[PDB]
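Worked example (supplementary).
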Amino acid sequence: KIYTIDEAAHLVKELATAKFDETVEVHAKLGIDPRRSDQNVRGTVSLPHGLGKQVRVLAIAKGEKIKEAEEAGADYVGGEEIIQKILDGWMDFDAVVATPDVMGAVGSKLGRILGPRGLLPNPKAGTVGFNIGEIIREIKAGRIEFRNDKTGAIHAPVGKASFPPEKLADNIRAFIRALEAHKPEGAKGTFLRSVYVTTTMGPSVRINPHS
RNA sequence: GGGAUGCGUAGGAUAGGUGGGAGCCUGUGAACCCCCGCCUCCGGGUGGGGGGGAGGCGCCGGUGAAAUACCACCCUUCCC
Ligand code: NA
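After joint prediction of all chains, the assembly is encoded as:
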């Protein structure tokens, strides 16, 4: 059965039965061919009501920007010298941001470590930039990545199940819209083949993405 | 359509992809034992039955490109 977003938002209350505050997910089977590089969906979006989770942000910057990342609220901040701390297996954070001037050292020394974990700072994921305080403030306000897997599916967290239905409904549209804004011009056919709403431990519920 | 299947090497060992995840399961019967179906890369995996009677599993750690439970969306090959 196909539910509306407003319907699905309200059902999270009932789907969420684990003994913790479950994250609310959105999944979509995408209308692309993920083989071809030009059909890749990748980008970020500021959820209008936040993730509702605290995100330990590390910032590796240079010069004044180290002060900027500090004041933007990044949990740990340092120069190229915290590379050697991750080289020793520190790795206690959720997201790495970085200014372009350090990405030469960061890439070559931590690419092989941060890369496979989707933690490498990357322009395409909104994690590299001299606007490093806006990146941190955008993350801390609940910006999320989304990047199709090779199977052509795509997934994103869009809230906690403790949120009011109407706020979850908002976050779901916002992410749905941001998907459609990254619909590759080469992608033929229906873009959002299917779209489901679920919680971490809970069952799925297919939704009407234009509702 | 229905049913399964998912193992280079390193690693408890059979890690399809990715996202979520700090919890999941269990007297409405856990580990463990036996019997049978199927699958098998011959390591094992998996379904069912009987016994059993309170503990399994994850997180952590280590290994690894990636980490284990659990959940979701997909993908694969196979049988009917
Ligand atoms: Na683990």
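Two points are worth noting when inspecting this output. Chain A is about 30% helix and 20% strand. Strands of chain A lie at 23-30, 42-46, 57-60, 76-78, 95-98, 143-147, 153-160, 192-199, 205-206.
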